[PDB]
Design a protein around this ligand. Structure first.
Ligand code: CA
Ligand code: F
Ligand code: MG
Ligand code: MG
Ligand code: MG
Ligand code: MG
Ligand code: MG
Length: 306
């Protein structure tokens, strides 16, 4: 079987998309196994419990295997031994990263709100029925990635996909399922700083500079008031531990629709140069910023390339 696997530090799109695409591949006679590179977030556990799924197989070494990548195209987010695997496919909605192959492959990459929107397009292409349970987790993944349609990554395709999947899944009030997921994400009391920094964290190679970016999407920024200094101390430790150029942590309020970014960087003017918004003692408020892939990464990557 091929293994279908999303990014390191998987989120709901990576987990649910691996399950949904493995099902589709098996239905079309292409043996597949869904896998994961890490533990589930509370949000993803909530989604899988709601629709009756077990977590996919936890698997970290893929040398000699065929792999269908979900929800990224980056060396830093792939299995460590992906160069000794064969990538047979990528389904994604990110920038084109530094993965490569030696062989022809499939890529279903679209600049939409969720990888699961593209996986639904694959089900449509093959004319395979989406079971109710699979539809539910796909629906949840799109509601999560699009921030209940608030994110600027959201497209008409994502909305139409949620509407179609919600009908299949038997969900009438899908926006309340969306809000439920963000209430789960907001339940951060008593969680160690490092577990919050790493909950939704990605490394990026930006012109040979290693940049770590975490994100914590919540309903109310004030949940971070007491732990903010602990988060700041922790990102400085994480910077050193991984010999990173920069570590950024987005504290994202989905109701204000903006983010406070905590910054530790070898570049004193990083956010001034990237966004035209200077940090002050390592913090900057980024009005309107919800999306890492659309509103955070591009300007940073371009600033490192220049
Ligand atoms: Ca490439
Ligand atoms: F995702
Ligand atoms: Mg993801
Ligand atoms: Mg995604
Ligand atoms: Mg996501
Ligand atoms: Mg995300
Ligand atoms: Mg969570």
């Amino acid at each position: 079987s091929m293994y279908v696997v999303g990014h390191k530090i998987p989120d709901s799109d990576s987990i649910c998309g691996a399950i949904a695409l493995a099902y589709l591949k098996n239905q079309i006679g292409e043996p597949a196994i869904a896998a994961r590179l890490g533990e589930l977030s509370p949000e993803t556990a909530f989604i899988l419990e709601k629709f009756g799924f077990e977590a996919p197989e936890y698997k970290t070494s893929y040398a000699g295997e065929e792999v269908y990548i979900v929800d990224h195209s980056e060396i830093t987010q792939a299995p460590d031994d992906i160069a000794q695997a064969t990538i047979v496919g990528i389904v994604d909605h990110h920038k084109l990263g530094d993965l490569t192959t030696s062989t022809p492959l499939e890529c279903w990459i679209r600049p939409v709100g969720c990888s699961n929107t593209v996986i639904k397009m694959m089900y449509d292409f093959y004319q395979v029925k989406i079971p109710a349970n699979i539809a539910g987790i796909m629906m949840c993944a799109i509601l999560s990635d699009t921030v209940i349609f608030k994110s600027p990554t959201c497209t008409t395709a994502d909305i139409r996909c949620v509407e179609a999947l919600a009908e299949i899944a038997g969900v009438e009030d899908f926006k309340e399922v969306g809000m439920d997921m963000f209430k789960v994400k907001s339940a951060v009391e008593g969680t160690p700083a490092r577990d919050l920094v790493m909950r939704d964290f990605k490394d990026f190679n930006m012109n040979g500079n290693l940049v770590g970016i975490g994100q914590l999407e919540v309903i109310d920024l004030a949940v971070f008031d007491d732990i903010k200094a602990d988060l700041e101390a922790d990102i400085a430790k994480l910077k050193v531990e991984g010999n990173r150029h920069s570590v950024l942590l987005l504290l994202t309020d989905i109701m204000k629709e903006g983010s406070e970014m905590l910054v530790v960087s070898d570049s004193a003017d990083l956010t001034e140069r990237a966004y035209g918004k200077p940090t002050v003692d390592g913090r900057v408020w980024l009005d309107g910023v919800l999306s890492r892939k659309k509103q955070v990464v591009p300007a940073l990557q371009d600033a490192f390339q220049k």
